[PDB]
Amino acid sequence: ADMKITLFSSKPYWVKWFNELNKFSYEINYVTSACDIKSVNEAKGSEAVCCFVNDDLSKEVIETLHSNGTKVILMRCAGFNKVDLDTANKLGIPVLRVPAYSPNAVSEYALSLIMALNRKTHKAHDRVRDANFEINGMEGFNMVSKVYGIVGTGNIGEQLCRVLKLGFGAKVIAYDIIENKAVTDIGIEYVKTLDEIWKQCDVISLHTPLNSQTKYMVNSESIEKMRDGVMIINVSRGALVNASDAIVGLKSGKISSLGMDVYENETDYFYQDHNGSIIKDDNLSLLISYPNVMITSHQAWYTKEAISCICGTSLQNFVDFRSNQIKKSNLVNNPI
């Protein structure tokens, strides 16, 4: 019990890294299933549980977890939108996240999606595999010929700004409620209203969190106000884009391409192999089938450095918990 971790939403990459980095003699119970009320029993007698972005740390499961001997929750990710902190606080349970995995991983993936919808290397790859070497349809653009707008000049945003403005010499505009200095210091200009981003930008990448303001940022109102042939990247939170609006945009031609590593109803799909079963989500089924849409299963973060840091940090969180030395930066809630 005292040294046992039950790790929910296990996959081979989790096992591989958590073992490699487990230098502290911890017993790890890897559960393939996700942490929901049907699964929370598997943690019985486990002092610590480790969860990921799509686990269900709801009031009831937390209560069960506490009523069965677990005392610390380990978020092996920086997000916690699905953890009822209040239940945890009242039960004296710390939740401990990994606030800082390499943001370059997410920014350079966002670039990846741009390059891919641009030069269409996947399309090329799918054709050549079928012995079709015709390149009609794969005309791209020089990177400097488009105006990139970044919404959210934070930790990931800032990086995408550097690589663009610095690596290609492109014209880059930012919209943010604050104003990251690193962005203004390399001659990138901020616009006061998003309405300017639409008017001026050819490819837009979103790097804000999801909140009552940013939700459905991309919708019919804004899509209409956008340029023709706009490319939209979104590797942040799926709900920044109203997918059915986005489809209308794509159908009517207003939107040239769409790249998303995240999706509003992603919880019932990502990370799992569901071949042979009908996706019942029609927007998601359609987006996947459209030929100018990149949809990937929330993997922008998955580099060697990011997952090494994630696992190593969660394990470290456990040892900190037990030496009563929790790092302020990793404690999300406030238990008694």
Ligand SMILES: NC(=O)c1ccc[n+]([C@@H]2O[C@H](COP(=O)([O-])OP(=O)(O)OC[C@H]3O[C@@H](n4cnc5c(N)ncnc54)[C@H](O)[C@@H]3O)[C@@H](O)[C@H]2O)c1
């Ligand atoms: N694997 C993945 O796909 C993955 C990995 C890490 C982070 N993310 C997502 O990327 C998003 C941002 O990442 P980050 O680490 O750079 O966060 P961050 O705190 O460093 O930056 C968030 C920025 O959004 C700015 N902003 C501008 N307008 C805003 C508005 N109207 N409402 C709220 N914020 C506004 C804020 O000032 C802030 O700087 C996160 O929401 C996170 O969910 C995805």
